[PDB]
Structure formats: C-alpha cells, structure tokens
C-alpha cells in the first residue's frame, strides 16, 4: 500500500524526559504536481516545541520531492503517549514550479497520530531482598519493606514480585540428559555412575 500526500515520520523508539533532542519527519509527494507544503506539528502541553528551520518557508516538492524540517524537542509527560504531525497541499504559491493544483483526495491533508513509550530520566539502580518460609502443619510470615528516599526524583519506584520455587525454572534438560551406562576405567565409571 501507498499514501499519496502524507508525512512519513521516523525517529527513535523510546526517549527520556530530562534531556532535549530533535526529530525529523518528512512529507512525501510522488506526484509530478509540484507542491509547496507547510509542515508543522500540533504540540500539546506534554512537551514544548522550538524549530530550527521554520523562519524560512518551504519551496516545493515535485514527483518524489520532499521538504523536511527538524524540530528540537523535550518532553514532560510519561507513559504510552501519542505523537502529532501535519501535512497538506496549498494553492496559489506560483513561485517554485510551473503550477500547483493542490487537490489530493477528500482526505488530502494527512494528520498522523503515532504512539510512544518514554522511560524515565536518572540513574536506574534497584533494591531487592527475599526470604523463604515453610511449615508442615502450620503457618509462618514474612515482611519486607524498604524505605529508601535519599533526596529523590519522584515517580521512579517500582517492584514486581515473585512467589517462586526455583527448583525447576528451566531444569528439564539436565534431568533427562545426565543418564548413562558407564564405560572405561574405574574413574570413568565413577563419573558415569555417581551423578545418577
């Protein structure tokens, strides 16, 4: 499948809130009608946008021509978040090519909305303890509670627990490999017989 008048936005997959960066998305015209396209993005309060080549207007994009503009960016929100861009042909700018009809299909303007996971800023270190309890005829009880807020950045904490017996997490293959009828000298048989 194709799209006639669209913005193909590509970028890294996951970013960080703290530091700033730029991204670069492109509008694509596979049509010999050579169009000046005014690309922009609709920025939410989740981030602030500042461009680097928006003072100058784009010129035109003929068949397979493409006008691309960079946008420095720093986010503030978190989580699975959407991403915004814009695209549409424009009329009456006869300065670049010979003409510009500027009428793709009724969905001529292309406004893409793309997702994003944004893991956090800062030094990701961890915390973890454990314990084992078992009565045969009664009850036991554990308690783990780790208060570690030294001069912190908030919304960082997360654990994900395990009630587990790791006797056989992935222990099938030794348990049905290590079986043999012995061979050779005495020490050979002892290694072939003792693990069993």
């Amino acid at each position: 499948a194709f799209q006639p008048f669209f913005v193909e936005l590509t970028m890294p997959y996951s970013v960080i809130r703290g530091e700033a960066f730029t991204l670069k998305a492109t509008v694509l015209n596979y049509l010999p009608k050579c169009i000046r396209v005014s690309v922009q993005l609709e920025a939410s309060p989740a981030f602030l946008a500042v461009p680097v080549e928006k003072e100058q207007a784009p010129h035109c994009i003929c068949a397979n021509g493409r006008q691309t503009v960079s946008w420095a960016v720093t986010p503030k929100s978190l989580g699975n978040v959407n991403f915004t861009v814009s695209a549409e042909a424009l009329e009456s700018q006869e300065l670049c090519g010979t003409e510009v009809p500027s009428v793709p299909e009724h969905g001529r303007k292309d406004t893409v909305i793309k997702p994003l996971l944004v893991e956090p800023e800062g030094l990701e270190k961890e915390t973890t303890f454990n314990s084992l309890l078992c009565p045969s005829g009664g009850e036991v009880s554990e308690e783990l509670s780790l208060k570690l807020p030294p001069n912190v950045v908030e919304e960082s904490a997360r654990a994900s627990v395990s009630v587990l017996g790791d006797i056989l997490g992935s222990a099938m293959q030794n348990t049905q490999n290590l079986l043999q009828m012995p061979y050779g000298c005495g020490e050979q048989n002892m290694v072939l017989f003792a693990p069993n």
Binding site: E121, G122, L146, N151, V152
Partner: peptide, 11 residues
C-alpha cells in the same frame, strides 16, 4: 525494584 537517583552533585 526499579527507581531513580542523581538530582544533585552540581556545586
């Protein structure tokens, strides 16, 4: 656990 540190050490 998963958590974050280092907001300072800029003196």
């Amino acid at each position: 656990l998963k958590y974050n540190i280092l907001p300072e050490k800029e003196e």
